[PDB]
């Protein structure tokens, strides 16, 4: 859960940077991929606890 | 116990499918970026490879 | 005066070479920027150069 | 004197281009600073530039 | 005037050494460029230098 929060904040930072315009779209896509990966990891951990 | 485990496994597989689809999209975007850079002249063949 | 003229011409040639390479870099970055493959900051930096 | 005036105007144009790129960079950093997404050291450095 | 001549000769030697190393780097990059193993940006930068 802590990792998910950190990754979400990182994704928000990258999205803001692209919105004002500082980085390419590849960084945004990579950040979104990382966020989806951490969400899947959170789901897996929840199922393991269950 | 087995039924519960199988249901949880199905849900986890769905989530992993979504994550891997997003990863594939990101990799495709990166490859297109590298190909465009190579066509312009700022990249070598090994980068697109 | 001939020596001074030669020195001035050499300085002009150096400046022209720098301008040429800067213009080439600007053209390449402008080509890459079309579909948002490089940051706008890099394009602005190249234009300033 | 015409040549000297032309040289001075060219130097002024160079300085103006540098100021323009610095101002654009600092404006983008100020826009980003609202959500605490950049350390204040970077913003101070951009303002000084 | 002899001292001034010596100073000018030393400056010329420094410039010649810089030109020699730049030319060597350019020749090596030109040999490498044949098989598209270096991006044209690096070759153009070396040529400008």
Q: Count of alpha carbons within 13 Å of C29, Cβ hemisphere only?
A: 19
Q: By three-state DSSP, how is residue E20 classified? A: helix
A23 to chain D, any CB pair closer than 8 A? The answer is no
Whole-Å CA distances, D44 to A23, D33, D47: 21, 11, 5
Is A27 in contact with A14 (CB distance < 8 Å)? yes
Query: Which ranges of chain C does DSSP label H, i.e. alpha helix?
Result: 2-32, 40-48
Is B40 in contact with C28 (CB distance < 8 Å)? yes
D24 to chain A, any CB pair closer than 8 A? The answer is no
- The tokens 């950190």 sit on which residue? A6
For residues A40 and A30, what is the distance between their CA atoms, to the nearest angstrom?
A: 15
Is A32 in contact with A11 (CB distance < 8 Å)? yes
E30: DSSP letter? H
For residues D10 and D45, what is the distance between their CA atoms, to the nearest angstrom?
A: 27
Record the tokens describing residue C10, joined without a space.
């050499």
E38: DSSP letter? S
Identify all chain C residues contacting A26, using CB atoms and an 8 Å cutoff.
37
Record the tokens describing residue C18, joined without a space.
């720098």
B44: DSSP letter? -
A12 to chain B, any CB pair closer than 8 A? The answer is no
Contacts of E38 (CB under 8 A, 6+ apart): B44, E29, E32
Is A27 in contact with B33 (CB distance < 8 Å)? no
| CB contact residues (below 8 A), chain C span 6-35, against chain B | 28, 31-32, 35
Is E29 in contact with E38 (CB distance < 8 Å)? yes
Q: By three-state DSSP, how is residue E33 classified? A: helix
E41/B41 touch (CB, cutoff 8 Å), yes or no = yes
Distance from CA of B45 to the nearest CA of E (A): 7
C39: DSSP letter? -
What does the CA dihedral A33, B33, E33, E28 come to, rounded to 10 degrees?
Answer: -50
Record the tokens describing residue B3, joined without a space.
């039924």
- Is residue E5 left, alpha or beta, with left meaning phi > 0 and alpha meaning psi from -120 to 50? alpha
Record the tokens describing residue E22, joined without a space.
């730049």
Q: Which of A10, A14, A16, A18 has the highest number of chain D CBs within 10 A, making it the mutation to test binding with D? A: A16
For residues D24 and D43, what is the distance between their CA atoms, to the nearest angstrom?
A: 13
For residues A32 and A10, what is the distance between their CA atoms, to the nearest angstrom?
A: 10
D36: DSSP letter? T
- The tokens 């160079």 sit on which residue? D14
Is E47 in contact with E26 (CB distance < 8 Å)? yes
Q: By three-state DSSP, how is residue B49 classified? A: coil
Q: How many residues does chain C have?
A: 49
Q: How far is CA A23 from the centre of its chain?
A: 16
Record the tokens describing residue C8, joined without a space.
């001035």
Angle between helices C40-48 and C2-32 (to 10 degrees): 170
Is A43 in contact with B11 (CB distance < 8 Å)? yes
């Amino acid at each position: 859960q802590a990792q998910k929060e950190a990754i979400y904040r990182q994704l928000d930072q990258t999205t803001q940077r692209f919105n004002v315009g500082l980085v390419a779209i590849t960084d945004v896509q990579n950040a979104r991929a990382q966020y989806d990966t951490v969400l899947a990891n959170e789901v897996t951990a929840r199922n393991n606890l269950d | 116990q087995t039924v519960r485990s199988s249901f949880n496994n199905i849900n986890a597989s769905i989530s992993s499918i979504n994550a891997y689809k997003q990863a594939v999209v990101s990799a495709q975007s990166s490859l297109d970026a590298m190909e465009a850079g190579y066509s312009v002249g700022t990249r070598t063949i090994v980068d697109v490879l | 005066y001939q020596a001074t003229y030669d020195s001035a011409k050499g300085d002009l040639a150096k400046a022209q070479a720098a301008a040429n390479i800067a213009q080439l870099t600007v053209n390449r970055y402008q080509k890459l920027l079309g579909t948002q493959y490089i940051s706008k900051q890099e394009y602005d930096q190249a234009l300033a150069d």
